[PDB]
């Protein structure tokens, strides 16, 4: 959360929160209703967003479903759906939190080795996250889509 970062930085210099940090928390709490509304909106779109992200990823990266691909096979689709669901949930958690730390902790710190274990290509991750971002921003309002864009592009950049 934004407050967590502000408190950590305030302890780092051993003093009370600066007027800049206090105004940061001001803007964070003042925008709480909008951020929660956006996160709630991301929820009603469960299967819709998951499937448009999935088939856009398949079109963009046919190798994944082509023979020899790591995601090739019907059983791989079941894991695909829940993996995209996990990343969407992390995006919503970051949206409400105001920072990408839930995303970093739950799904980014150690994802690199994790997908190396599964022999998963990181480019598949970036293309899937870009498909998710496209669908979500298309569904959301431009002002809110801009705010969600930071989270989705952070997911893409951190996955690679």
């Amino acid at each position: 959360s934004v407050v967590t970062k502000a408190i950590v930085s305030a302890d780092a210099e051993a003093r009370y929160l600066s007027p800049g940090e206090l105004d940061r928390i001001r803007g964070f709490v003042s925008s709480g209703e909008r951020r929660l509304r956006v996160a709630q909106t991301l929820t009603e779109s469960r299967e819709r967003i998951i499937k448009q992200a999935g088939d856009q990823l398949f079109q963009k990266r046919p190798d994944l479903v082509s023979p020899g691909g790591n995601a090739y096979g019907a059983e791989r689709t079941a894991s695909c759906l829940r993996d995209l669901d996990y990343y969407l949930r992390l995006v919503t958690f970051g949206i409400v939190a105001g920072d990408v730390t839930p995303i970093e902790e739950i799904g980014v710190i150690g994802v690199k080795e994790m997908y190396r274990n599964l022999e998963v290509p990181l480019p598949g991750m970036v293309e899937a996250v870009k498909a998710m971002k496209s669908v979500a921003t298309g569904l959301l309002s431009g002002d809110d889509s801009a705010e969600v864009g930071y989270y989705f592009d952070y997911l893409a950049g951190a996955l690679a």
Partner: peptide, 13 residues
């Protein structure tokens, strides 16, 4: 600020 956010999210690209 909008430009800085876009670049911050997309520096790798």
């Amino acid at each position: 600020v909008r430009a800085a956010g876009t670049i911050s999210a997309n520096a790798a690209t």
